[PDB]
Amino acid sequence: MAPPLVVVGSANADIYVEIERLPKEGETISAKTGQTLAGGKGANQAACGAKLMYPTYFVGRLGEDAHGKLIAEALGDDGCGVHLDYVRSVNNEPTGHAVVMLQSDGQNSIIIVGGANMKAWPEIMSDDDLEIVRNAGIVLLQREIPDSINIQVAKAVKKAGVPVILDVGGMDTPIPNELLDSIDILSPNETELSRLTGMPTETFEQISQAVAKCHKLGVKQVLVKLGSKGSALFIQGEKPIQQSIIPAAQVVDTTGAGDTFTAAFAVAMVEGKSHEECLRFAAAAASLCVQVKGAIPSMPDRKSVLKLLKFSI
Amino acid sequence: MAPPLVVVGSANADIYVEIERLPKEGETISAKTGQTLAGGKGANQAACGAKLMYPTYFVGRLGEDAHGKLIAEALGDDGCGVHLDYVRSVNNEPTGHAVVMLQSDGQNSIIIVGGANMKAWPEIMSDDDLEIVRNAGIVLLQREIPDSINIQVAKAVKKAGVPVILDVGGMDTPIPNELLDSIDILSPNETELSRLTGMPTETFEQISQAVAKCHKLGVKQVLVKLGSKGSALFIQGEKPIQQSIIPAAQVVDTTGAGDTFTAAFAVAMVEGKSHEECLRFAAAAASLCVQVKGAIPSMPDRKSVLKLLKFS
Ligand code: NA
Ligand code: NA
């Protein structure tokens, strides 16, 4: 086959509940409604690539439970078409999940259980496992699995010569410099970029400043996601490429948009498109993503993204 | 071949998370651990009956989602052996669930989602559903599905001459007297019994008067659950029969104990056992249940209960 998109990272059951207010301590309240959906930044990114019709493998750890089966079904042959050969399930850990509480004011609130995502990985990565990443055309990581696993994967691709992208989404902890040294593209949003470098990110000069610091952490390319403000690709020693959002007819649900943007950029990149085309393609995929409820259900197919591109730029 | 226990009621995914503190608006936190378990009063009582090796059907409503599969796997062929022929799944409602957030203290914050338990039932019960209850040996109800459904069931079985037990656990609203008039045995705890009578229940005598006020509105039998104090069966026209707890060597988890007690009581009763023997059977089941963490996993098989009944 063509050199595959290989995603190593998390899979979550997202437990959404609609409440009026957050419950007080010791207090029992009722929710209006609820929904449980397949998610996790890793599974999201893999679903995205598969829907865009690029050969995609997901490397992850699931529990042997209902939440785990939910994931496999959404991603697999009856869903997005992700190759699940390297997903392993354990019986001593639960599939990771997130209780997402949508209050009536408009904000969100999240409790995350690491589960298999954080606990079912081996101390040392098997060669059998590392062979898929060694055959990748491009590798995507996030920060919802252990740093140790991320580092071992990145290093295994370094000694293989193929792009490794690290989405900063996930844990709010500082990134191991050992990890930064081993990736090709860093991909943060505004807060993550700010939190990471400590520097303000309210303005483009400020953002460029924060990126300059990323360059000094050893990262040659930074793909900054600015939400409504668009995106930019910074390549050390070159002029930044900026891309505004592709406006959506209706913003229904932004869940998974960051994941969509990153995975679509990766597909465009591994297909050999120019950096400008990559940013445009990613922006169009993200634009479609936000018009449908749910992360994985909202992943657009390639022809829709290309159609939006034709008529938006 | 024996006329089945038929449980009509709720099924819930219980989502337990151990956390340091509660999150705030626009915030993400992480939990120590987390586990999602099959529960709900209807599903618990059905599981108990099946695990007691008595033919048991569960009539309930699920969502077409992972939590629905979780329930069905816990209850069905690969689990407790409940007959799930009358469980229906819908695609426009989630399986009922509760998010239980255990904080560092001992303080619990809970969110309840009614889901299909409250919203997936029909306006009028199908004749299929009413057929299984009309063919029942005994029918168990609770208050975690709409009153309308409980009433239509209770009327059908009264017609068929089938005993009905109504567990008061669930909603904290008052019980419609149309429901009270159609059930054979009402089954509250000391706290629920006080809430629907207005009277106090800290003393035995106060309980007997509240129960006297249950005979008021047409309830001929009351099975009161008293936790550590045991239980009492009040049948109007007879004298209060009692059973203290069969002492547990070690109490690990009392979740589902009331459910186990009620279902085991129903199994003993439908098997033709005497009222005294019924209470003892239920007490023994409840005793084994509290020695294991969880609700469904702690349900004892018939052999464990019958081995414990050989003792004192
Ligand atoms: Na979406
Ligand atoms: Na228990």
Strand ranges across the sheet with A12-18: A33-39, A12-18, A96-102, A108-113, B27-30
What's the total number of domains in chain B? 1
Query: Rounded to the nearest whole angstrom, what is the distance from the C-alpha of residue B286 to the centroid of ligand 2?
Result: 9
Determine, for residues B30 and A70 on separate chains, whether the beta-carbon distance falls below 8 Å.
no
Task: Specify the CATH number for the domain of residue A5.
Answer: 3.40.1190.20
Q: Rounded to whole angstroms, how far apart are CA atoms B9 and B225?
A: 19
Measure A299 CA to ligand 1 centroid, in angstroms.
Answer: 7
DSSP chain B: -PPPEEEE---EEEEEEE-SS---TTEEEE-SEEEEEEE-HHHHHHHHHHHTT--EEEE-EEESSHHHHHHHHHHSTTTT--B-TT-EEESSSPPEEEEEEE-SSS-EEEEEE-THHHHSS-SS--HHHHHHHHT-SEEEEEESS-HHHHHHHHHHHHHHT--EEEEEEE--SPPPHHHHTT-SEEE-BHHHHHHTTSS--SSHHHHHHHHHHHHHTT--EEEEE-GGG-EEEEETTS--EEE-----S-----TTHHHHHHHHHHHHHHTT--HHHHHHHHHHHHHHHTTSSSSTTTPPPHHHHHHHTT--
Write out the DSSP string of A50-67. Answer: HHTTS-EEEE-EEESSHH
Q: Which residues pair with B34 in a beta bridge?
A: B17
Give the closest of A66, A97, A112 to B28, CB-based. Answer: A112
Contacts with A75 (C-beta within 8 Å, 6 or more apart), sequence order = A11, A38, A43, A46, A47, A50, A58, A82, A84, A296
Select from A190, A148, A196, A140 the least CA-distant residue to A165: A140
DSSP code at position A189: B
Phi then psi for A293, rounded to 5 degrees? -80, 145
CA atoms within 13 A on the CB side of B53: 6
Look up residue A304 and give its two tokens. 């829709």
Angle at the Cα of B67 (from B63 to B68), degrees rounded to 5?
Answer: 45
> Obtained via which technique?
X-ray
Q: How many whole angstroms separate alpha carbon A103 and alpha carbon B112? A: 14
**Three-class SS of residue A113?**
strand
> Residue A232: what are its φ and ψ, rounded to 5°?
-155, 140
End-to-end CA distance of chain A: 32
Say if residues B145 and B42 touch (Cβ distance below 8 Å).
yes
Ligand 2 centroid – CA B57 distance (Å): 22
What is residue A172's three-state secondary structure? coil
Instruction: Write the burial class of residue A220 (CB in 10 Å: 0-12 exposed, 13-18 middle, 19+ buried).
Output: middle
- Comparing CB atoms, the residue among A29, A97, A111 nearest residue B19 is A111
| DSSP letter string, B39-58 | E-HHHHHHHHHHHTT--EEE
**What ranges in chain A are assigned the alpha helix state H?**
41-51, 66-75, 116-119, 127-134, 147-158, 177-180, 190-197, 204-216, 257-270, 275-289, 302-312
Sheet holding B12-18, edge to edge: A28-30, B108-113, B96-102, B12-18, B33-39
Q: Mutation target for B interface from A17, A93, A100, A144: give the one with most B CBs within 10 A.
A: A17
Dihedrals φ, ψ of A36, to 5°?
Answer: -115, 125
Length of chain B (residues): 312
**Checking DSSP bridges between strand B12-18 and strand A88-90, what pairing results, if any?**
unpaired
* A221-225 vs A231-235, strand pairing mode: antiparallel
Q: Give how far Cα A26 sits from Cα of A33, A83, A192, B18, Å.
A: 21, 44, 33, 14
The tokens for A185 are 């593209």
Compare CB distances from A66 to B27, B34, B67 and report the shortest one's residue: B67
**Contact at CB, B30 and A108, closer than 8 angstroms:** no
How distant, in Å, are the alpha carbons of B117, B254, B262, B270 from that of B143? 10, 20, 14, 22
Q: Please, what is the Cα angle at A208 between A205 and A213, to 5 degrees?
A: 130
Do B112 and A31 count as a contact with CB atoms less than 8 A apart?
yes
Residues in binding site of B for ATP? 189, 225-230, 258-259
A137 labelled binding-site residue: no
Q: Alpha-carbon distance A225 to A82, whole Å?
A: 25
Using the CB atoms, write b or e for A4-23: b if 16+ within 10 Å. Answer: bbbbbbbbbbbbbbbbeebb
Question: By three-state DSSP, how is residue A239 classified?
Answer: coil
CA distance A169 to A259: 9
Question: How many whole angstroms separate alpha carbon A192 and alpha carbon A171?
Answer: 10
Which ligand has the minimum distance to the alpha carbon of residue B255? 2
3-state secondary structure of A20: coil
**Residue of chain A nearest B118, judged by CA positions:** A33
Q: Any idea which residue has 């998974």 for tokens?
A: A256
Stated resolution in angstroms: 2.0
Sign for the pseudo-dihedral over CA of A255, A258, A261, A262: negative
CA–CA dist B97, B13 (Å, integer): 5
CA distances from B303 to A155, B26, B156, B282 (A): 57, 52, 34, 14
Distance, CA of B93 to CA of B185 (rounded, Å): 32
Hey, which residues 58-117 in chain B have their CB within 8 Å of chain A?
65-67, 69-70, 73, 94, 97, 99, 101, 103, 107-115
- B297 and chain A in contact, CB less than 8 A: no
Binding residues of B: 12-14, 40-44, 144, 189, 225-230, 253, 255, 258-259, 289, 292, 294, 298
- B159 contacts: CB under 8 Å, gap ≥ 6: B134
Is residue B225 within 8 Å of residue B258, measured between CB atoms?
yes
Distance (Å, rounded) from C-alpha A165 to C-alpha A225? 14
> For residue B154, what are the domain limits?
1-312
Q: Which of residues 220-279 of B touch A (CB under 8 A)?
A: none
Of B260, B251, B263, B185, which Cα lies nearest the Cα of B224? B185
Annotated binding-site residue? A13 = yes
Query: B25, A109: Cβ pair inside 8 Å?
Result: yes
